[model samples]
Target: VNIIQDFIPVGANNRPGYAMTPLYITVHNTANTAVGADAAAHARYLKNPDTTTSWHFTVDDTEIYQHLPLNENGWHAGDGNGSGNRASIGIEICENADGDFAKATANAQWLIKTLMAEHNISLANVVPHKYWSGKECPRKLLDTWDSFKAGIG
Candidate 1:
């Protein structure tokens, strides 16, 4: 099981506060390898929102922190203001030097599977941040994205 810590707030990331019914699940890799860059950092960033970016969840080896609600959209997808931005739930995977990368990946896989069922989203609805824009997000897993998808199923 994953630890759940919610940190969603009003007016974060310029959110219009529209209700959402997620049809897609988007994956991302933080690519931040600082000594303590983990789920809590991501959650703090989402709260302050210094970069005009936000997401739904952050997955680390030992924690699954939720930055937003499943019924709301996040700015994790780089596709601008579009369906991809509003219709998907974003889950960020942390890459921290002090964390377990393999366990983080496994936790994300498990989280995605649980979300898919809760939202009635099929495996086909699972996508990467790159699917929205021409970006190499979740960079480490892009080449083996299919494998990740399979794991969720």
Candidate 2:
């Protein structure tokens, strides 16, 4: 399953002088009730400077939205580590949260697999949003990262 484009580009801020070599891709969930069209619109227009948060992509059960370009930095990860902020690409999978876990899992797995292949990334390069910040996000899939890695291989 190839990634569909659900991206919104927010330009880099205080970008490091030397590009931080990305070692991981972080996964997240919007944790919003909105799905499909509402979710897509929110992602496109909801750029808050104070929050400074955006994801490289947002995937629903059926589609993927590329919010930011793959090569650029996104502010999704909460930790202020210069390395993480500069390096990791963020992707938020849209889920009902209380809804279909199987569909969300499938979409998330498909996205990571496709991206890892397309970008020449490996299972070693994937991490949950909580890994760096110690916050459970993309909540339903937090404990499934290891399985996700295996799936990609």
Candidate 3:
């Protein structure tokens, strides 16, 4: 998985710079089904000041953009300074209307495996965004969550 290092600048307000152990991998779906909503689009979104919310990485069918460092936390988990926000690495998969969802999902799975090996995180901790906030997120994948988990290893 060729992850592009398009990180948010260190001093940016959205970049919290807090330390993280990366105990979990919180998966999410962009929820943006617009035609051009891809990883690069999300990366550009993170760099701007419009949205305070941030995540570590974004994946589309063709590319992956890392918006934050692995050792740091972002604002994606919806938990206020809690474990979900501070202890997990957040990954958002693009759901653009023009994108190939199956390919995007496979790419995300590969990145999940790579991060698991890089961080020593167990498959059990690779969870849906709903796991933290009870919101129906990663909405597309949760229906087939079991199979997704099975394919990770």
lDDT, each prediction: 0.83, 0.63, 0.91
The candidate with the higher lDDT, 1 or 3, is: 3
RMSD of each: 1.4, 3.7, 0.9
How many backbone collisions does model 3 have?
A: 0
lDDT against true structure, model 1: 0.83
- Model 2, TM vs. native: 0.74
TM-score of each: 0.93, 0.74, 0.96
Q: For residues 60-148, could you state the per-residue lDDT of candidate 1 as single tens digits?
A: 98898987767777776877777678899888999999999999999999999898889899999899888889799989899999988
Among all candidates shown, the one with the greatest TM-score: 3
**What order do candidates take by lDDT, descending?**
3, 1, 2
Q: Give the true-structure RMSD of model 3.
A: 0.9
Deviation in angstroms for 57 in model 3? Answer: 0.8
Model 2 bad stretches (over 4 Å): 1-21, 34-39, 47-51, 97-99
Instruction: Report the error of model 1 at residue 4, Å.
Output: 2.6
For residues 1-153, write the lDDT of model 2, one tens digit per residue: 345554442343422223445656788776765434334554555443333466677766655666566666766677776545667777776655444646655776787777777777778778888877889876766676676667656
Q: Regarding lDDT, does 1 or 2 come out ahead?
A: 1
